[PDB]
Structures are given as structure tokens and as C-alpha cells.
Structure 1
Amino acid sequence: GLQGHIACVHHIKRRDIVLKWELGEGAFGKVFLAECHNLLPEQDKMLVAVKALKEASESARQDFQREAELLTMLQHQHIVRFFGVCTEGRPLLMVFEYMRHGDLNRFLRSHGPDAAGGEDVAPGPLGLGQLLAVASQVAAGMVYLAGLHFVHRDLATRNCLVGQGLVVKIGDFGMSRDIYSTDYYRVGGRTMLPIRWMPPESILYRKFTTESDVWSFGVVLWEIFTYGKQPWYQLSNTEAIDCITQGRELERPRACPPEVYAIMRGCWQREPQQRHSIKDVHARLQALAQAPPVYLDVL
């Protein structure tokens, strides 16, 4: 997830972390809700999500350290905040900010056409303004990653998290292949590819670039505007590969304005060099997100 893409690492004493309960589980680890003391100056006691490494072998312990360095380097307003590690005695822990709404896919699906409202979100389906705000924030994170020349390779709503006030940030706990196995095509004994999010040059030639990530962001934008539906849900994995390699584009979601569909299409140009940059995609979305209701009401 971090290594092969593209100490400074903060450490937290084990006694400052108090585990409350499990949030999620995977092949390589578990995530807990925890209380963290003395972490931030204003907050004496705050909630965090703690990722526990399952096996602390030499390879895993080295992978953990490389991951920690990279997460320390990747810090920005629309990227999930990494606070540091606890490496004094096993299990090795990585401490992150807690994102109350969970992953963006789950959030979209629970605020769909069928949709209750609450503290951060009105009742019913998410409105155009809110869908645009979600898209814009994900785009802002990709702009920052593109700027560092980091190639994500698994950009999808399942790999974004949603926090209080609907702050949307790019990030995941490395368990998406376990939780969302249907979103991956298993090729090897172990290898699982997110083919539905992948451009033709990633599928055909195995090239992953900043341009392949913008393609994937195009598909993220489609997910947002279909309230988390799977791209190509009607097709098998082999059928999806054929569609993508033959140049079939995803249809415009019912909730998607033509102007927004045009932004998706700009991400899905066959030739990578002809795709619009994520900076330009972010600018168009931010503009739409921030547009007055009078403008947005006729879009």
C-alpha cells in the first residue's frame, strides 16, 4: 500500500493508549478504537483508531517501519492523520485519527436514494452540493499525492474515510481486499487487482502512473454519484476487463449532472497523456462544490 509507491516517525508510549474495542479485522491485522492520552495539547483524552500488526516477523517488522516512515511523510488536510507508532513490546501499533462514519463507500450506501439523517448529514439521499463536496475533498488529497509523485494504485471510495462534519480523507487500514473481496480480481494464489477502477494500460500493460490514478478518480466520482454502487456491477471480472480494454465507458449516473459527467469523461481518455490533471479536476469540482444554490439548482 505504501512501499513501491512513489527516525522521522513519532512514538507513543503503550500506557498512553487504552484499547476499547475492535472496529475491523483482516489477514495482516486488526483495528481498535482506543483512547489516547497526552497526544494533542488541547485534547487531554481523545479517540483514535489503532492498527495492530498481526505477525511481528523480521519482514513484517521492516514493512511496518517503512509504512510508518511513508505515513509520516504523507500528511495533509485530506489524508487520514497518522499520529505515530507504539513499538515498545508486541503487538506493534500504528495510531490514527478516528473517522466516525467509516469508509466512504459504506457512507454513500447508507445515504442513498432509498434513505436516516443525523448530526452531520440531512435526511434522505445526499444532495448535489454534498456529493460535490465529497468528490472535491477526495480530489484535493489526490492533488497532494500527485504533487509528491505518489501513485496510490487502489483509489476507490472503500479506501477513503469519512469523519465528523463529513470531512472526507484518503486512507485505509490495509484490509480492503478482506472486507471488499468482490472489488478485486484474484489472479495469483495471493494477488488481487482492483480491475474495475483500473485503466486499460494498467490492465493490459501493468503500468501504474499519476494518470492511472486520475482514471481511478474518474471511477471514484462515478461511485460518489451512484451512492457507492460497484462500477460494472452487472459484469463479471473477465467481462469487466473486456469492457475496459475495448474502451466502453461507464454510463452517466441518474444523479450526475452532464457537467460532472464531463469531468468523469476527462479522466477516462484512453491515452494517459490526454487525461486532465488532478489539479484541473479538483478546480472544477471545488468550483461546483462552492457554487451558489442558484447556480447548482439549474446544473
Structure 2
Amino acid sequence: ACVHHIKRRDIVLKWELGEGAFGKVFLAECHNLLPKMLVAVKALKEASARQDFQREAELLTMLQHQHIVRFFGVCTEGRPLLMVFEYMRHGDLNRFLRSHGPDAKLAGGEDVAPGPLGLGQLLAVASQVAAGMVYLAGLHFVHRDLATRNCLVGQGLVVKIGDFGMSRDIYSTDYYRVGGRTMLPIRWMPPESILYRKFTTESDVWSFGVVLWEIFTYGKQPWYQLSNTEAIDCITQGRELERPRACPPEVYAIMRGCWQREPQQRHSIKDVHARLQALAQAPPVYLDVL
């Protein structure tokens, strides 16, 4: 620390936002912070736990990017220990995708169109996540849990990458429990991770392709038809995911580039970003023929 601190008197808890196996989240007001405003603070079911606290906090202060969830600091004066995050109006990206497509019948508010998310908004979401992964790959930080459930959405449809937390709880359909003390998002993992237990930046690229998949299917779980073991089988043996139907061939071409068996044979995340960004800012005329 080397970590910003926030006095408790500046933080006023309003109500709970969510609850994890080890942490709670409250929506709260935070005074004398900027330049008054709303923040999301997390409390800790302390057990030991006071070690991983000032570990995550130091990391989050190092990770400052336009597409990584902002971290304002901590409150260590007294208990419980708090981490002050910025508040993202629309919650996690998976809940946002499911609630806006393909029905979605009107269903859009202040930041989002009525019906299902347009091709331009889908590409805009993917581009932002890729942009966040380029940053993390630039610092050689491996995420090991890249999914929509770990991405937050704020006002003006700002997508930012984070790491729950909540994910382990009530999203347990997305995890395979092994050993009793460890769960694995095997549906998002590359073959060299499932088999060889190896996680690299190239493993994140595979994960992003699966995230890029999710976006164009509105939050639907990968290999939804399959069980945990069956999903492992298909990924190991080298089965690829479907594309229908909001995904243009040009975009599915990007997913497969992330889904090469050999990690070195995959494309860089900077490359994937470049293609997704161009497609995002491309004119309607170009996008209507995709």
C-alpha cells in the first residue's frame, strides 16, 4: 500500500447488490472521492482471509485501463475490510445479454435498443472485451476465468473486464468441481488446459473466442447440450462450437482463429481486437451485407 485508502465515514452503505461464497456486495455512496457518487463496495466474510485481501487490492491498483473495472481503493480502518469499486448499472455481461435478445420484444431503455442487440452493438461489446484482454496480455496477466459472467456493463453500454466472486455461486452450472476445493470453467478452457493443466495468454485467447461466441448467442452457455464430462470429451477430441445465427461468417472466422488446437498456432489478441474494432466502427452499408 501502494494502495489508495478510503475513510469509513465517507462510505455510506445503501443496500446489498449480490452475495458470494466469501464476499458480499453493497451499493453505497462515497463522499470526497471525485473530482456524492455511487460505488459498489465488497465486504468480506473473514476467516487467513486478511491475506488475500491486500493481495487482490494491490493487483487491482496496478490494473488501470479503460476496459478493466475501476478500483478506487480500500477501507482497512476497522472491520469489515472493504474494496470500493465503480458501480456498473447493468450488472454482469451475461445477464445483460440474456435480457436483450432474441426476445427482446419496448425492451430497451436509456442505453439500449428495443429489440435484440444489433450486429453493431454485439461487435462493440466484443471489441471492448478484446481491448481489455490486449491490456492484460500486455502485462502478461493471465485471467484463467474469462467469461461474460465476469464482465460488467455500465451506463452508455461500457463493457469492462473483471473477476468474480459471484461466479462460483449460482453460476455453478458454468463450473466443474474437482477435489472439493477447486472448480473449473472447463467449457471455456482450451485443450492444453484441460489435459496438461497449463494456462497461458494463449489460453485466454481460446477463452475469448468462447466469450466472442457467447455474445453472438446472447448469453447461452457453451456446450449447453452436454454435461461436464461430455464437454471435456468434445473439447479434448477437438469439436468446435456452432455459429447460428446472429454471427456473420466473417465474425465466426475470428472465433476459429482463437480455437486452433495448438496455442502458438492461434492469433494474437491484438490481432483479434484489430478486426473486431474495425467491424465495430464500420459503416452500416458495410455491416448490412455481412
TM-score in same-fold range (> 0.5): yes
- Shift of residue 185 of structure 1? 0.4
Post-superposition shift, 1:97?
0.2
Contact 2:27/2:38 (<8 A) preserved: yes
What whole-Å deviation, never above 9, does each CA across 1:197-235 have from its counterpart, x for those lacking one? 000000000000000000000000000000000000000
Q: Give the gaps of 5 or more residues in structure 2.
A: none
Deviation digits for residues 65-118 of structure 1 (CA, Å, limit 9, x no counterpart): 011000000110000000000000000000000000000000000001110111
Aligned to 1:77: 66
Residue 130 of structure 1: CA displacement? Answer: 0.1
Does 2:275 align with 1:284? yes
**Which of 281, 286, 290 is the equivalent residue of 1:295?**
286
SS of 1:8's partner is coil
Deviation at 1:172, TM superposition (A): 3.5
Distance, in Å, in 2 between the alignment partners of 1:99 and 1:217 is 21
Q: CA deviation at 1:174?
A: 1.4
Q: Matches of 1:67 and 1:137 in 2, distance apart?
A: 23
For the 8 Å contact 2:90–2:153, the answer to whether it is kept is yes
Does the CA contact (< 8 Å) of 1:29 and 1:53 recur in 2? yes
Contact persistence 2:145–2:163 (CA under 8 A): no
| Structure 2 residue 107 is the aligned partner of structure 1 residue 113 | no
**What is the total number of aligned residue pairs between the two structures?**
288
1:27 to partner: Cα distance: 1.1
Query: Per-residue deviation at 1:253?
Result: 2.6
Task: Give the aligned partner of residue 238 of structure 1.
Answer: 229
Instruction: State the 4+ residue runs in structure 1 displaced beyond 4 angstroms.
Output: none
The answer to whether the aligner puts 1:60 opposite 2:54 as a matched pair is no
Find the residue that maps to 1:165 and give its secondary structure: coil
TM-score w.r.t. length of structure 2 = 0.98
The corresponding residue for 2:12 is 18
Cα contact 2:21–2:168 (8 A) shared by 1: no
- Distance in 2 (CA, whole Å) between partners of 1:239 and 1:62 is 37
Identity %: 100
C-alpha separation in 2, matches of 1:195 and 1:246? 14
Q: Following TM superposition, by how much is the alpha carbon of 1:60 offset from its aligned partner in structure 2, in angstroms? A: 1.1
| Post-superposition offset of 1:171 | 1.0
Displacement, 1:189?
A: 1.1
1:54 Cα offset (Å):
1.1
CA distance in 1, matches of 2:26, 2:215: 27
State which of 151, 155, 159 in structure 2 corresponds to 1:164: 155
> Equivalent residue of 1:254, what SS?
coil
Following superposition, the deviation at residue 190 of structure 1 comes to 2.0
Which secondary structure does the structure 1 equivalent of 2:195 belong to? helix
The normalised TM-score by structure 1 is 0.95
CA deviations 1:116-173 (Å, max 9, x no partner) are 1110001010000000000000000000000000000000000000000000000144
What is the rounded CA distance, in whole Å, between the counterparts of 1:23 and 1:166 in structure 2?
19
